[PDB]
Design a protein around this ligand. Structure first.
Ligand SMILES: *[C@@H]1O[C@H](CO)[C@@H](O[C@@H]2O[C@H](CO)[C@@H](O[C@@H]3O[C@H](CO[C@H]4O[C@H](CO)[C@@H](O)[C@H](O[C@H]5O[C@H](CO)[C@@H](O)[C@H](O)[C@@H]5O[C@H]5O[C@H](CO)[C@@H](O)[C@H](O)[C@@H]5O)[C@@H]4O)[C@@H](O)[C@H](O[C@H]4O[C@H](CO)[C@@H](O)[C@H](O)[C@@H]4O[C@H]4O[C@H](CO)[C@@H](O)[C@H](O)[C@@H]4O)[C@@H]3O)[C@H](O)[C@H]2NC(C)=O)[C@H](O)[C@H]1NC(C)=O
Ligand code: XFT
Ligand code: CA
Ligand code: CA
Ligand code: NA
Ligand code: NA
Ligand code: ZN
Length: 805
């Protein structure tokens, strides 16, 4: 119940929301159907429209008007945004030449430059170039300020997950808004775009920027907007708030536009009908900047122009139906469209089985346009699993397609021509970022970055300490003129042991064999030097990784590679080696095919054993440093040490052996040498974080050898590829992956073919940031480089996407 017979007189767009049953006058009252009886009359004035005209200049103030053109309007803070242009001979902001904003030029009483976030729904990254002729205000923001060619949204590339990630710095699995539609089995409640459950605070986790600001004594304007409030009134409301007395005035404001998404769904991303919505958004930016200029704030405020996701061509005819694959389609609930999420229709149905549903959906049709996954098998870069609102079965839908349960769902719901939601590396899903103002740089282009990073920057712009989030604070310092955040590297928690030769061969009873009894003062001192680290400078280029948790491990040196060997997990945490452009690939010699050699530096008790692999009929092993890339026949023996062995399913060995035998050398050839760091990952609870020993769900049968859930590699070279990886003077270039360690290749529908036709495609799908590997391993890389720490943070957040231009 709302007692809507209270009044909005003197309350229009009040910032503090009043509680039930008292009637409301804030910017969300319409959404709750709770506005006072006189809200439209008093707060949504429209008389005489939104622009001054020559005849209105100097008029007698008429409080009925939408905005004012009387002499008093500037001191009232309620002029039409074009007042000074029409009535005082001033220019529009867009017509003024760009002039660098070296320092804030703010009115007296301003404690800090305000921040205005101007969020555009469905604004695809390529609109900034493709629509530039029809968006002159946005083009001035972009060209004069700091811009990225695009900004990467989070998955799924839907509105609410992305706007709430922008606000919190968190992945959707952590903030809890994992789709536009959700079921939470603990609450037993459903969240929808339509309706009221979405107003319940229990859905919305983390700490959004307006709460962060308020907790730290920075006032915030209200960020959500009721859809029916026209954009011109949203802009005039922000400008009125900016005219509040110092003690009342917010320091952070948000404008939201439902365009161009609304039209893009109807017309497709580049439908001829799209020009007009882009013109209208640009006119809104123009009103805001003219309005700021009238208030002498246009060289004081920092403005962020940012989108939530892009827009792809999608029509009804490109729909896959689950009824074409499943016999039992009425036993499932599907959340449909540009991603699929499946769960049982009834928790009482004991015959429901996810394994049989996955198998029925796997590679069934030659050009099948979705791929099913258990959520823990989704690419780790999506960070889309650790939330009970994410169903166990996920369908990754190809760009331009939908999935639905039955055909009747689609024609009893062609209308639409655009949609979004797909994998967030897809080019059509990318969106925009421009920062303009005293705190941003001038005429500066920055590389693409992820939207999870912007919360920290917004906190920096406002002098706030961010709540804990998934950004990497400091990685966007290159966007800023001032207010940079100067992080320190994390402290190493565990220091390594450096074991020497401590064990005799006969102390080992591992069931291993090697034909190495194959028999010099020149070359014996030489081999001893390699074991003490004489080549370590060639193979550990950026320092050893730091171990950020408590554990016991050993550094092991060799001619061709260095490793940090875990006595707890019985395998390396990391193995590092450099392959020059001139490196030669060789074979595993016949006499060494099944060779595994005890490592006399490491106790039998802290070693793997061959008998466990013989006994485990499902599990084989591979090596982290590949024997194919040994520098000499004699160095090759090091590659067969038991301390270089890791457990690998035979299906996975197909992938791994092709990466090591073919792709490493291909990269070294293309990039002028590469440094590779490879290792295992254990993430049995799919939280994106390193498992402790007591979280390991699978061991090599009969043993204490834990089975990795994934294997990573970080592949680094010189950004200037005229310099070899091992003699690089400047910035680095990286690409990385986190490959799922699976006992079959069902994910790859062409896996019966030669690995040259499917393995690199798999690897691209599982591309990763070095930061993703850091979370998953508790290691900290690139500790010893010539580069600034903020530059290294940017490098650790880089994702190689393998999308065309
Ligand atoms: C991305 O960045 C985020 C933010 O930094 C990272 O997430 C953090 O990760 C931490 C580890 O997973 C996690 O720390 C835990 O916090 C527990 C207290 O949690 C509450 O309070 C915080 C602080 O205000 C709050 O933010 C939390 O909010 C979550 O939960 C509510 C639901 O109630 C949601 O609305 C909200 O969206 C959010 O959900 C997300 O996180 C939870 C996990 O907390 C997931 O389950 C959800 O799926 C969703 O992803 C909470 O309200 C604290 O209890 C934990 O402590 C246990 O573990 C420690 C280990 O040190 C142990 O020592 C303790 O004893 C304790 O164990 C006991 O409980 C166990 C479980 O019941 C039990 O098994 C044991 O036997 C013990 O009794 C833990 O410290 C932190 O909360 C989240 N924060 C957020 C916002 O998500 C995220 O990791 C980053 N991602 C990547 C990839 O880097
Ligand atoms: O604006 C709209 C549409 N619209 C319209 N009317 C609404 C009325 C109320 C609510 N409620 C307020 C109480 N809630 C809330 O304050 N939650 C946070 C504060 C406490 C913890 C998290 C939960 C949400 C949401 C909306 C809403 O979305 N769309 C644009 C937009 C802008 C910014 C963001 Cl971040 C997002 Cl996700 C969406
Ligand atoms: Ca959207
Ligand atoms: Ca984990
Ligand atoms: Na075996
Ligand atoms: Na296959
Ligand atoms: Zn949309």
């Amino acid at each position: 119940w709302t007692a809507t017979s209270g009044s909005c007189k003197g309350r229009c767009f009040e910032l503090q929301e009043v509680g039930p049953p008292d009637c409301r006058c804030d910017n969300l009252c319409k959404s709750y159907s709770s506005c006072c009886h006189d809200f439209d009359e008093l707060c949504l004035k429209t008389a005489r429209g939104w622009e001054c005209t020559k005849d209105r200049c100097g008029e007698v103030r008429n409080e009925e008007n939408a905005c004012h053109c009387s002499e008093d309007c500037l001191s009232r803070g309620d002029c039409c945004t074009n007042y000074q242009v029409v009535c005082k001979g001033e220019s529009h902001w867009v017509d003024d030449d760009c002039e660098e904003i070296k320092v804030p030029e703010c009115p007296a009483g301003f404690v800090r430059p305000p921040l205005i976030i101007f969020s555009v729904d469905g604004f695809r990254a390529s609109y900034m170039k493709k629509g530039s002729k029809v968006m002159p205000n946005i083009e001035k923001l972009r060209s004069c300020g700091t811009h990225a060619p695009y900004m990467r949204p989070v998955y799924p590339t839907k509105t609410f997950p992305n706007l709430y990630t922008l606000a919190t710095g968190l992945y959707p699995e952590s903030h809890g808004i994992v789709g536009n539609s959700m079921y939470d089995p603990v609450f037993d409640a459903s969240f929808h775009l339509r309706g009221r459950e979405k107003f319940n605070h229990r859905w919305w986790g983390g700490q959004p920027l307006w709460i962060t600001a308020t907790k730290q004594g920075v006032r915030a304007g209200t960020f959500f907007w009721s859809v029916s409030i026209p954009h011109e009134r949203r802009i005039l409301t922000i400008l009125q708030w900016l005219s509040l007395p110092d003690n009342e005035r917010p320091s952070v404001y948000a404008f939201y536009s439902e365009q161009p998404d609304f039209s893009g769904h109807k017309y497709g991303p580049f439908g001829p009908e799209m020009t007009n919505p882009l013109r209208e958004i640009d006119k809104t930016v123009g009103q805001l900047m003219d309005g700021l200029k009238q208030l002498r704030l246009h060289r004081c405020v920092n403005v962020i122009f940012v989108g939530d996701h892009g827009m792809e061509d999608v029509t009804c005819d490109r729909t896959e139906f689950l009824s074409n694959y499943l016999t039992n389609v009425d036993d499932i609930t599907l959340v449909p469209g540009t991603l699929g999420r499946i769960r049982a229709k009834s928790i009482n149905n004991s015959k429901y089985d996810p394994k049989t549903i996955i198998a029925a959906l796997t590679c069934k049709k030659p050009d099948q346009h979705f791929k099913p996954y258990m959520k823990q098998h989704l690419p780790k870069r999506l960070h889309y699993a650790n939330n009970r609102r994410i169903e166990d079965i996920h369908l990754l839908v190809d760009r331009r397609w939908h999935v639905a349960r039955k055909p009747l769902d689609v024609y009893k719901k062609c209308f639409f021509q655009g949609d979004h939601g797909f994998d967030n590396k897809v080019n059509s899903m990318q969106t925009v970022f421009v920062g303009y103002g005293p705190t941003f740089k001038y005429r500066t282009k920055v590389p693409p970055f992820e939207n999870i990073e912007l919360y920290n920057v917004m906190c920096d712009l406002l002098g706030l300490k961010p709540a804990p989030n998934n950004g990497t604070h400091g990685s966007l310092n290159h966007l800023l003129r001032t207010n940079t955040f100067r992080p320190t590297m994390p402290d190493e928690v565990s220091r390594p042991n450096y074991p020497g030769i401590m064990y005799l061969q006969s102390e080992f009873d591992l069931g291993c064999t090697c034909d190495d009894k194959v028999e010099n003062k020149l070359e014996e001192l030489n081999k001893r030097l390699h074991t003490k680290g004489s080549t370590k400078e060639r193979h550990l280029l950026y320092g050893r990784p730091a171990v950020l948790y408590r554990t016991s491990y050993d550094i092991l040196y060799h001619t061709d590679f260095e490793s940090g060997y875990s006595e707890i997990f019985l395998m390396p945490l990391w193995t590092s080696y450099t392959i020059s452009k001139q490196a030669e690939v060789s074979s595993i010699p016949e006499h060494l095919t099944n060779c595994v050699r005890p490592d006399v530096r490491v106790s039998p008790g802290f070693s793997q054993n061959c008998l466990a692999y013989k006994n485990d009929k499902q599990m084989s092993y591979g090596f982290l440093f590949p024997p194919y890339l040994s520098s000499s026949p004699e160095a090759k023996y090091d590659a067969f040490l038991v301390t270089n062995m890791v457990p690998m399913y035979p299906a996975f060995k197909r992938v791994w052996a092709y990466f090591q035998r073919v792709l490493v050398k291909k990269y070294a050839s293309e990039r002028n040498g590469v440094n590779v760091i490879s290792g295992p990952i254990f993430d049995y609870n799919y939280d994106g974080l390193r498992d402790t020993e007591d979280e390991i769900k699978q061991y090599v049968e009969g043993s204490s050898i834990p089975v990795p859930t994934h294997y990573y590699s970080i592949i680094t070279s010189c950004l200037d590829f005229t310099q070899p990886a091992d003699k690089c003077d400047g910035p680095l270039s990286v690409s990385s992956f986190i490959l799922p360690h699976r006992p079959d290749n069902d994910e790859s529908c062409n896996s019966s073919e030669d690995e040259s036709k499917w393995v690199e495609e798999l690897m691209k799908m599982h591309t990763a940031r070095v930061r993703d590997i850091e979370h998953l391993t508790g290691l900290d890389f690139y500790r010893k480089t010539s580069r600034s720490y903020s530059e290294i943070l940017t490098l650790k957040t880089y994702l190689h996407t393998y999308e065309s231009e």
